Every structure is written in C-alpha cells, then in structure tokens.
C-alpha cells in the first residue's frame, strides 16, 4: 500500500560535531600577519531560524588549537635573534645609592664584568644596571638562568602589541555562533547563526585580570565548569570596563655593547633624574560598584544570606601570585592586594595604587629551560587599559562554615582564550541523505 | 538579516528544505599556517571526491534529487509521508535513521549493476 522506494538527496542540511584545523584571517610583530589571509571587508553571517544547538565551553578544541598556534608563533618569532651565551660570567655588583626612595632600596644593582669582543683575542670591561630579581649571589652575583639554560635576547625591532586575529574554518565545515544573551557557556542555545570566520580576538597575555577583553551585553556573568567543586576556576565577565593606568616613570637609557661579529647586547646605561617605583592606579568608586555587582551576582549561586569575602592570593610563583602583564615591551608584576580585600554581608577622587616590579628575564609559558631577555626601553613608559573580567578561586568550601572566601586566580593562559571562544563551535556538514518517495526508476 | 542562505533551511521541514539543495551543494568545495591550510584543503578535496564517487556508484551521477529501484523496508521506519515531509526536519530524520545507513547503500550498489547488465543485454539484440 505504501509502495515507498528509496531516494537519495544531495545537499541535505545536516551537521555533526567534528574537529579540524582553522586558519588565519587578518586585516614587524610577534603575531605574524604576513602569512595570514586578508580579512573580507564585509563579513557575512546567516541567522538560523528555529534551530537550537548544544554548547559547552569547557570541551572546546578551539582553545587548544589557539594555545598551540600562539606557542608556535612565539617560538618562531625568537629564532632569528642573538643568543646571550657569553653573558654567563661572574659579575661584581654594588648597591645603587643615587637619588632613591625608601621603597626602591636594593631593587637595583650596579654590576661590572668582563666580556668578549668582535675579535676572539681581546676582552673588554663593561658595566650595567640589573634588577634584584635577575641576579643571585654566588659581592659576586650571577644571572638566575645560568644554571638552567641560556636564552636569546628579544630582537628590538619586533613589537609585542596584540593584533586582532580571526579564525576561519575550511571548506565543508561551518562555525556556529550563539547569539543568545545571558547564555552561560553550557546548555542549549536557541538563537544560532552560521559565520564564515570568528570575530577579532586579541591574544592578550595576562594573569589575575582580563585586559582589553569583550564586555557582556546584559550584566555581570559568572561561569564555571562545576561551581560546587572548589578546584574549578570561576570566570567573571563585567558589563562595563574599569580604567587602570600603569606607568614606569624612570628615565632609562640604552647602550649597545658589541659582543661579537654582528652581535650586540643592549644594556641599561644609567637612570636620569630620580628613581621611584612603577605603579598602577585604579578608580575606587568604580571598583566598589563593580564588586557590588559581582557579589550581587554571586549571591544567586552561593546562597542569599551568606557572607562573601575577598582576600589575598594564597601563594606560589610570582607569575601566579601577582598580576603579571607587559606594557610597551616592559614586563610588570603588580601587587593586587588592595583590590581583593573586603567583606560583604547580606542586608570621591581617591584611587587605589598598586606598586609593581619590573622584570627582564621572562619565562612566559609554563616551560622550563627556555627563558627570554627583554631589552630595556628608553624613556618613561605609560599605558591605560580596560579591566573587563576576573578569574576567581573559592577557598575551602566545606559545610562547616557559611562564609565563602574568593581569592584571585590565574596561571593557565587557556582561560584567557576560553573567555572569548565561549560562544563558538565547529561542525561538519553531511550532505548525503536517504528518504522514502513515490518514484520508480 | 540573511536568514535564507546555505544552512538557513536547517530548521524548516524536509519538504521546504528540499527546494534549496543547490546552496549547500555549491559551498562543499569552496609559513606554518600554510601547511595547515594545505592539509585542510587536501582533506576537503578527498571528502568531496568520496561523496562524488559514492553518488556515482549508485547511478545518480549528476543529479540532486534522484530516486532509485530499491524499495523501502517498513522495518527501518514505520512513519508515513504525511508526518515526514511536512512534520519533521532533516536533522531529526537523520538522527532517527543514522543506524540503518549502510544496508541501503549496499542495496543500491548491487541494484545498479543488474540494471546495467540488463541494458547491455537489451542493446545486444
């Protein structure tokens, strides 16, 4: 009675979850745009009507791909640069006592040492200024990395500024984007669209604070893989930014020492004028309002009558303990102790000042045996940035106490990549299909 | 908005979605980063050639909507056309019948050769 016969259809709209390799799309720098495809001036997006998809930000291969690509680019950028192997020599250092305050005492060391020259016969005696975090006593001192590995000096012509990068899928695949506001990164998104490429993402490297990020369109958002478990980090996204102004006011001077044929080492000659600590400034009232919004949102998940505590970081390495970042090629580590210090109970123009310490020998990624030397920058440095998110970790969490304490977190940079690709997924099309029909060949 | 285009008919019914197969058909083809791009292009070309070969083996070469001689078994599906072509989406049907895919392919493949042999025999006379 049915007399139904099989029929083959090509081009059926069906997709399945899959993993593939995405490629560049962009409009001297570390993030090489030379080998990255030009971006279309008029990108196209197609809203899918009456289509609800499943999303989960904590199982995204895009984050891993981005991390691998960023690490590969960073490794590639440093290949054609000078290797500071001869620098591992016995230094003779003294304290700097020339126009310093009570907080910068012992921070700088004036060192002298012998070094090679272009000719392999002669030697030259030179001097330099080093930071206390870079020299370890063996009056005799040595570089911290000498007993681990010798790393290359970053070339002075490349720039560390982040450039937006768009990720595009290959032919036969598609990228689905969730346009549903108040979506918390896990569950069914009912509003979906297909996009040829991902919006511009700045690969900003920072810890304890998300800088120059994207802002929520509705209100403060809280995300976590398992909020009940304390071992899982909590990502907080603001709906408005907070301005932070970070400056190093020392007037540095750069000098070149010829250590070999076509090989120059850049050193800090001397500081002109006064010496004082670099520091950051953050608005107080804006920070208080942001923390009020954050605690209001946190009360939804962790009870209405609970006490919410913000305190200092537990401890560990300087990178995870302090807010680490860079400004104009100068690597800052700031002490964010005055911000996350307060208690909340259910019921003008002053600015918070964060002192910061500068570093030159850098191990950016969590790797051992590959450091990097940042050449000094000439003149004072200043910059302004937007705080648009936080990474928090719960302390304890046992049922014995009703007070919840949140502390700053960080360390793993994948989270910085997970705060931007939380509304994207990749699928592959399956055009072939079989159905019943009334035909007869 | 660009509601219609490529996958815009994903949420529509099968009857409505069958009218726009061409938009999906067109897009199936189109230093360290270059290697990844080349690998992706090679995989895409291989997938397209595999799909084209599978279509060709069944005798539906160069056709988007091609019916065949293999009859439909009621065991695989019991729903009638009344509640399928206008009361269901392609995604739902594919999810429902993802189990019973290969048998129909084999039946089509073995059916095509018999038709070819019969055509040769008829033309022999």
């Amino acid at each position: 009675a049915e007399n139904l016969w099989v029929t083959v259809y090509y081009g059926v709209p069906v997709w399945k979850d899959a993993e593939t390799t995405l490629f560049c799309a962009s409009d001297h720098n570390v993030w090489a745009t030379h080998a990255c495809v030009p971006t279309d001036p008029n990108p196209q997006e197609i809203h899918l009507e009456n289509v609800t998809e499943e999303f989960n930000m904590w199982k995204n291969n895009m984050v891993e791909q981005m991390h691998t690509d960023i690490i590969s680019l960073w490794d590639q950028s440093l290949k054609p640069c000078v290797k500071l192997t001869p620098l591992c020599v016995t230094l003779q250092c003294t304290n700097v006592t020339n126009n310093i305050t009570d907080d910068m005492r012992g921070e700088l060391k004036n060192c002298s040492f012998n070094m090679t020259t272009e000719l392999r016969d002669k030697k030259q005696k030179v001097y330099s200024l080093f930071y206390r975090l870079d020299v370890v006593q063996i009056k005799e001192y040595r570089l911290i990395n000498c007993n681990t590995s010798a790393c290359t000096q970053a070339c002075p012509k490349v720039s560390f500024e982040p450039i937006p990068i768009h990720y595009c899928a290959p032919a036969g695949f598609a990228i689905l984007k969730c346009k549903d506001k108040k979506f918390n990164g896990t569950g069914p998104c009912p509003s979906v669209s297909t996009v040829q490429c991902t919006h511009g993402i700045k690969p900003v490297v920072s810890t304890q604070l998300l800088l120059n990020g994207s802002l929520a369109e509705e209100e403060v958002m809280i995300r976590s893989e398992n909020i009940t478990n304390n071992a899982k980090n909590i990502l907080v996204q603001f709906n408005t930014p907070v301005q932070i102004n970070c400056t190093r006011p020392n007037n540095n001077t750069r000098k070149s020492i010829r250590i070999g044929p076509g090989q120059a080492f850049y050193a800090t000659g001397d500081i002109i004028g006064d010496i004082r600590q670099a520091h950051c400034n953050v608005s107080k009232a804006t920070w208080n309002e942001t923390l009020g919004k954050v605690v209001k949102q946190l009360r939804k998940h962790f009870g209405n009558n609970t006490i919410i505590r913000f305190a200092n970081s537990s401890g560990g390495d300087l990178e995870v303990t302090t807010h680490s970042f860079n400004c104009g090629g100068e690597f800052f580590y700031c002490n964010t102790s005055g911000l996350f210090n307060s208690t909340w109970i259910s019921n003008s123009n002053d600015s918070i000042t964060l002192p910061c310490r500068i570093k030159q020998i850098i191990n950016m990624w969590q790797r051992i045996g590959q450091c990097m030397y940042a050449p000094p920058i000439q003149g004072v440095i200043r910059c302004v940035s937007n705080i648009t998110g936080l990474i928090l970790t719960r302390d304890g969490g046992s049922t014995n106490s009703t007070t919840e304490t949140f502390r700053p977190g960080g360390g793993d940079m994948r989270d910085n990549w997970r705060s931007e690709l939380y509304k994207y997924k990749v699928v592959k099309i399956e055009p072939l299909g079989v159905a019943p029909t009334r035909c007869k060949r | 908005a660009v509601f219609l285009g490529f996958l815009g008919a994903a949420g529509s019914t099968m009857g409505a979605a069958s009218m726009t197969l061409t938009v999906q058909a067109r897009n199936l083809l189109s230093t360290v980063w270059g290697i990844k791009q080349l690998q992706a292009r090679v995989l895409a070309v291989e997938r397209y050639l595999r799909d084209q070969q599978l279509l060709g083996i069944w005798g539906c070469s160069g056709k988007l909507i091609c019916c065949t001689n293999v009859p439909w078994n009621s065991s695989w599906s019991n729903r009638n056309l009344s509640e399928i072509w206008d009361n269901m989406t392609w995604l739902q049907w594919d999810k429902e019948i993802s189990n019973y895919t290969q048998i129909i392919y084999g039946l089509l493949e073995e059916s095509q050769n018999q038709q070819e042999k019969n055509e040769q025999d008829l033309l022999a006379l």
């Epitope: 009507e49 | 529509s12 019914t13 409505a16």
Partner: antibody
Amino acid sequence: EVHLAESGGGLVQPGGSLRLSCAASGFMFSASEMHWVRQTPGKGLESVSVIGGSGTSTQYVDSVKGRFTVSRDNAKNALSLQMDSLRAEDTGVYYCARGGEVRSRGGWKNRVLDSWGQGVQVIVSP
Amino acid sequence: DIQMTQSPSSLSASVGDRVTITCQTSQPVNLWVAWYQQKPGKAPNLLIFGASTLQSGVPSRFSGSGAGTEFILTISNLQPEDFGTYFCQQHHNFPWTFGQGTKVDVK
C-alpha cells in the same frame, strides 16, 4: 469572503442569563474551530471559550468555567454561547472568531484567529 | 496558564518612525506567537502568525522575529493607518492568552 455576524447582546442584571448567537458564512463550518473572545472596557482581549470542528471538544478559561457553555450547529452554520450567573466583570464586547489553518514559512501548520466578527455588546449592571 | 507580557505599555510616534514592540512569555511556546492590531470600534486584525510569517494582504512594512521567550514586532515605516492597539497572543496551548496591549498614537 468569510462573514461572521453576532447578535443577542444587551443589558442584563447580575446573576441573570443571556444567549449570544453568531451566524457564519463563506467557508466550511464543520471543519473550522470556533472561538468566543471578550474585551472588557479599558482592558485587553481574552479568549472566553473554544469549540472544535466536531462539537465534542469544548474548553473554557477558569474565570468562566462552570458558567459559560459553547455549542455549535453545523447544519445551520451557527455558534451559540450560553452565559449564566453573569457578573459585573463579564461586561464588554464579545466576538466570535474562526481558527483557520495556516502554513508557516518553515512548513508547519497551526491555527490562528484569522477572521473575527463585528462584536456584540453585553452590559451586566443592576 | 501562560501569561503574556508586552512592552512598552504605551508609545507616541510620528509618521515614518520605526516602532518596536517586545513580547515575553514565562514558558517556551516554540514560535507560535501571533501579532494583531485593533482600531477604535473595530475587531482585531491579524498581522503576523508564527512569529515571522506575514499574513496575506498586509503591507510589507510589518515584520516579526524572535525566539525562546522573547518576540519582537517591527513597523519600519509608520503610516497614518497603523495607529492603534497591538496585541501578542500565544496559541501553542489552551488557553490562548493575549498581551496587555501596546497603544501607538499620533505624537
């Protein structure tokens, strides 16, 4: 053209009874669901009751459940609403509407009130 | 019963202005939401059904969109004949609840 005409409204005291009739033409009456809707003065629309094509399925809102009865005559293509124990809140304009089957752009079929009558006034005051 | 909430309650707009009316539901109703217009002393007239399909004969300026529990009616080019009370109705399950109505009048 679909035509619906209401009649039987007027003034009634609280606790009284009243019948509203709706004459329909221009379509297949037996194959269309019928809706009784009311609009109170100064308020929005509200669906009072619904009756199916066969006349066996009838539904009402909680505000009128147990007091309002909806019936249909397919032979005469007529619809009837009996109201009993009328209250002051029942005052307003009553419309008889047809739930017509329509096809969405995606290919799904549902029913909407695509045709309405002119309406009839009922005033429940002492 | 599913309750329907409209916004704004009332609005004053001039000829040629773009009018946007939002309608919200407590529970999902798929996309079975219909937008009607009412003039003074006249019965409601259907404009949108299915939350995105335009009724035959209606001018193209009227459009509808949305998903989940949020739907939007858009009048791109307000005309003298489009002033009145707009309502959004859900017809997924009985009872079919209407909105409180948005009144658009001449400024």
